[PDB]
Structures are given as structure tokens and as C-alpha cells.
Amino acid sequence: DRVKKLINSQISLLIGKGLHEFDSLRDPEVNDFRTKMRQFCEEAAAHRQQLGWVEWLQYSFPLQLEPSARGNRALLVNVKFEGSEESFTFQVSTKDMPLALMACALRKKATVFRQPLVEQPEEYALQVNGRHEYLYGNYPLCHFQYICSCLHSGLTPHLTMVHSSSILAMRDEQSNPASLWSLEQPFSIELIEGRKVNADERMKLVVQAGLFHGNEMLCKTVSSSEVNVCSEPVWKQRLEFDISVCDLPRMARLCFALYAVVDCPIAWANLMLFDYKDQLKTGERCLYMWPSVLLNPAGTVRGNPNTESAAALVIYLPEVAPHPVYFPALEKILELGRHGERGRITEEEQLQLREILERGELYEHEKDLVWKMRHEVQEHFPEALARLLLVTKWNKHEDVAQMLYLLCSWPELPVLSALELLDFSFPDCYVGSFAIKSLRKLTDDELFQYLLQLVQVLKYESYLDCELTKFLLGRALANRKIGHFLFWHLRSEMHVPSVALRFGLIMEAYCRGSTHHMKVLMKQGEALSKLKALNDFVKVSSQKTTKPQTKEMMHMCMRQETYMEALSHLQSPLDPSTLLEEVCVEQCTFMDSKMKPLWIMYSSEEAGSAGNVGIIFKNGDDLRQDMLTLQMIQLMDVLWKQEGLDLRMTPYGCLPTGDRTGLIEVVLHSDTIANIQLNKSNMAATAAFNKDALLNWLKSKNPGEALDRAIEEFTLSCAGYCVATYVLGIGDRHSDNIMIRESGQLFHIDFGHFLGNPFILTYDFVHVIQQGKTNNSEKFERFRGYCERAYTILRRHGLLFLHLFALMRAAGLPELSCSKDIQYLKDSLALGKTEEEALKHFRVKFNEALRESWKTKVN
């Protein structure tokens, strides 16, 4: 089939890894995942191509609703009919549903075109002009992001009446073409020899190994004897662990750490004891070690792919039985765990359990209580499942068998509890499966909010075919926006050798279930290719020639045939709803930063004002910390809007796309507090006192009565950023990374340093809040009010921040690698305290930042 071979080269191109590389591994796990996932994904591709037209809209154009709408006023809208210049502007209510708007559009059409139309309002969908956005469903118009956004900017919604027939034309054009428990002996292994080893000649090499279940030690850590340093060290010694073979859990991992002493770590390596087919491993294995920066229980259970350089470690997994031993089936595990003894205790110990389970480290006598009252947990306190799972002796199969009996009979938990079970603290595969079962309830909007964390959990996975992968693939194929971001979250880390096989495999499976989207993602990947080359010309040229000259040699290069085709007509990788239509070459430029970031301007004739967008292409810098912080800010925005608090936040797009490569979304009509404070002459803001510049600037951008709105936009946005930077630890705040929109909105940029590494408020910010006045405690205290209100809202969702940041440890961020970094967040959200005790601390911290604010005023 010539059809398949072209698809095959395109997939290889898109994932920046040849599909021949996978078949060159000779690996059956890789081949079984490929075959099984292609099956699963083509079944999804088939389901989708036969979806209803409204159902196909829900896949392609999932609704962008306001946080308040999820789970009154007079409005003016302009409606057109697909394939016509003629448009109708009309009045509607913010309480009207799209069906009433479509009935208005058809009634106007009927009188204008002089026809008693057969055309039903139910037969249409409202597209947002020049955007991959639709308004459908029975929701009042204000509930839609585009409408609600339009009201705030004072713009007119621009819609196109799209008939069910053209939506089916879209679907059709986009279709895919045609026994262990009987082996009492302790755990032992023969450490044979090392290969391609590097260490100082003075030193004497030792191998240390431990048996783990995620983090927790199954038994005491055991080290080996000292060997003289050479390229090929030779041990041939037996390490006997304090654990019977029957007591080994399913998810047991044997972890190694090679370190030279007279003290320095050289390399580390891990392997699962049971294979993907649940059989206990025996024989000789070649552990291609990763460079060490004291075992690494978290690191990949897959060897270093660069088999040349890597310092290998030859081991012998000894034969435990003269027959192959597999891990007992769930039906076997449940038999052993069913027959248990129930905990009967007095009213006194009943108080102790309710006290401790609600109150998360414990004491060894209390762990014995929680285990004895484990039936009471399932019944009275199900959400305490995590505590109980932690007090389970995972190195003893009888206890583990008793736990899975309660787990398989456990009620489904809320999404907060399930997200907590995704952590590496709960490495059991049935616990992983239970957590996912309790997450199936996630809305596509919620899933999209936690997608980044779920992607990091993929790195904690021990085997390729897992329930999390199956889930994120099925949700991606059921939603084109989830599909888009899942693709990019994976594609961006393809340069990392530990994840390039897993991520490359997930992308291939996705591509098999979405042939059309692949071609849409290839077009994006082709634009990004050209931007790297164009950035490289800029980087070189900016050194030799002045900025106006480089700017024009870039503009010349952009005008080239291949660049014009490449950079035009594409879905924005920062937003699939945003179409990057016509590149405005003359308006493109670059920054005077070390990486010479490129500013790419775009416009749409069909979208009008909505099409005038820009992207920033940054190569040389790692954007993963900006994307986290912004996603965390966006969360706060959603959390606040849900309590009816709109703090006019600007959580702009930021997306890593490759190795120190990514895009950031341009927020137009905005300057830096720095550029404004320059206080340049002949400018409208030219201030007598520097404190005035910022307000003179707002006065200049918002004439007359509008300034009062611009001050409120600034006050609210200012309050939300004071909290965001406190709670999050956003340090290194200068005048050049605090920006202001012409609307009055304040926002922060350049989040390379968070979590410590209180609030930063100068008197010109206080001056704007105070409306120029010196003494204005009425206005200043509303700002403190908004700050406290916003902070109390976040604390209530403190655990959601805690659990998200926890799963984000897997991401390999240097400022987010251990529990000492989640510490800042527990301190800032004051979670081990009652709301008043927490408010008292916030008040003190606010006053302490306010006393630090009056240092500026002293002058």
C-alpha cells in the first residue's frame, strides 16, 4: 500500500524519529505496544468518522466556556451566512441561547433574500469569524469565552451561520483513508562486571543496590566490596537482600548506584523484576547506565540508548524455580486478601482514628491502628485511602493481598484524591488503575487543566502499555484540543533520551488515529523549522550589523517562497482555535535579548481585529518553568472566576516545542513599567514626578471617563499578581518583567525563577490604585480586600496546588526536584493552620511588603 508508506514517512518526519529505529530494537514490548495501540487508535478513528455533526463539533471545536458557566445585559452581534459578503448586525440579550441568535439570523435572511426558508435554526452552528471556534449548545451567550471577552473589550461578536452540511463536508475531508507465593528463598543476584567505566585511578569502585516499591525501601540497602579502578571492573559477587521471593511486589524495581571511593557517584541504572508479561526475569542483562549527578528509585527502568559511550553493568538474575514464574492473577490475589480478620475496638481508639485520619506523617503504633481499622477506613473514611495505602507493608504479599481486596471493593474518589494517587508514592499498578478509574469523570476542560501533570506521570510509568497512556490517547482522540497539546507536550521532549522511545510511540499511535491532524501538526512543525533557521540568521547578523539592518535582512528572508508558504495559514501551536493566516513581514521583528527572540506578526482578512495576533519564537532558552507558572496563574484565574472573582489576569500562552525551543503568545497594546518610567519627552505621559508617569500613561490611553475603568483593571490585576507572586514565590521582579496593557491591566513575564528562588509593590503602583491622591485609604484598602479575598480562595484549593506541584517533580525542573521545593508552597498557602491564623500571617506579610513599599515614599 503506497498510502501507508507516505503516512509512515510523514509520522517519522513529524516525530523527528524514524519508524525503522523502533523495528531495529527487536524488542517485543515495543512491537506489542505498537500493534495494540495502532488497533486501539484506528477503532477511535473509525468511531469519529461516523460521529453526528454536533458530536463532530464537540470533537473538533470543543466549547471554550467561561469558568462560571462550567459544570441580563444588552449585547450587539454581527452575523453572516457562510459564502456571502452581506452581514446582519442585531441586538440580543446576554441571556439568549445560540438558537435564538440563529432564528434572528434566518428571519433577517428570509426578509432580505425574500424567501420563506425551509432552513431550521437547529441545522446550524455559529463559527467565530476566522477562528476554529464555534458557539453551539444551550448556553446563554455570556457563558461563551468569545462573547464574554468581547463585552470586556467592548468589541462586537462576529459570527458566521455554518450549515450542518458544510460541517459534514469538514468531517468527510478529514477522515482517515482505508507459583511466586511458593518460593520462600531470599532475594539474591550475581553482580558480574562493569564495562566502559570512567573513574580516577586512585579510587576503588563499589556497586550499591536496593529493592524498592516507588520511593519506599522493601528491605535494607546492600553494598558490594571495593574493586580497583579500570575500564572493565570485575566483581562476580552475590548480594543477598532481606526479603523472600513471595514477598516481592508486582511493581518491584531493582535499583543500582556505582560510586568510586578512596566519594563520588559515576552512574545509576534500574530494572523491573517482573517483565511487562508479569513474568519474573532471569538470566544475563546488560544495564546501560545513565550518568549520576544514594540510589535513584525514580529514574527510567530502561537503559541508556547510546550503547557506545554508556558505562554498562553486566548482572545475573538467578533462576528461582526450574519453571517460569509469573505474578499471581488478580483472582488469585483476591482469594488470599478476602479471608481477613476485622478490627473490633472500644469508643476510645475510635476517637484516635477519626483524629489522625482527618489530620501527613504518622507514628509506628498509629500505623498498626490504621491497618487494624482498615475496614472502617473503606466504610467511614474512604478519602483516607492514601494514608492506609502508605501504612501497608508492601514487602509482605499477605498484607498487599488484604489491601487489594479493599481497593477492588473501594468506592470511587473525587478527582483531587485520584490525582494524589498518581504520585510515585503509590507505585502499585492496581492503585494506578484505580486512580485513573476515579479520573474518568474528569471533564475535557478539567483534563486539559491537569494534562501537563498527567504527561509528567508518564515518566514515572514502568511499562509502555499502561492505563494512563490508554486514557490520554482515548481522551486525545475524542478531543482535538487535548490531542493538539498532548502531541506538543510529548514532541517537545523527544531530544531527552530517557523518554524519546515512550513519547515517540504515543505520538505514532495518535497519528494512526488522526491522519488529518498529523498533516495539520506537520504544517506547524514546518513553520517552526523555518523560524529556527530565521532566528539563526538573526543571531549571527545581530552581532555584526545594527538592529535596523538585521531587521530588514530578516524581512528579506521571510519574503522567500519557502518562508511565505511555511509561515502562512496554520493553527497556532499555542492555540488550535487561533489561525495564523497572513504573516505581516513589515511588522515582524526580534528582541535585543541574548537569544534574539523573534516576533512574528499575523493578520486575518476573515477574522478582522481577532486575526491580528503575534507569536514569539524563542530558541536557546528552556520555557518549561514559564509554562508551569502561567498554567498555575491560569488555574488561580479559573478558581477566582468560579467564586465570581475576575482579577483581570493575563495568563498568556507559552509552549516548549523542542530542545530549548518554544513559542510565547504576544499580548498586544502592552508596554513594560520600565519603558513607561523612562519618562521620554514629546510623549503624552511626560511626568513632573516619576510616580506620575504610569498614571499619566493610563490617562493618555484612556481619555476622560475611561481612565476610571483602566484604574480598576490595574487594581484588580495588581491584587491577583501580588497573591500569585507571593503564593508561587515569583522572585527577580524588575520594572522590565512587569507589563501593563493599554486597558490598565498589569501582568508579569519571564518566570525563569519561582518558589522563593513577599509581594513587590512600589509607590507608582500605589499612586495608580489611589487615583493620583496621596492619602486614599478607601481605594488602597479595596486593593487589600481583593488581595485577602483572592488569597482565601486559593488556600481552600491549597491541596489541588500541592498535588499538581507534586506530580510536576517528574518534569526534571531544577527549581522543582524534591519536597523542599513544595515546602515553599505549604508555607505560602499556610495549610497547617485555620483560615484566621492563615489570614493573620497574610495580613502581617502584606503589611511587611507595605513597610517595604514606604522605603520608596520616604524620598
Ligand SMILES: CNS(=O)(=O)c1cc(N2CCOc3ccc(C(=O)NC4CCN(C)CC4)cc32)cnc1OC
Ligand atoms: C523577554 N522577551 S521575550 O522573550 O520576547 C518574552 C515575551 C513575553 N511576552 C509575552 C506576552 O506578550 C508580551 C508583550 C510584550 C512583551 C515585551 O517584552 N515587550 C517589550 C516592551 C518594551 N519594548 C521597548 C521592548 C519590547 C513581552 C511579552 C514573555 N516572556 C518573554 O520571555 C520570557
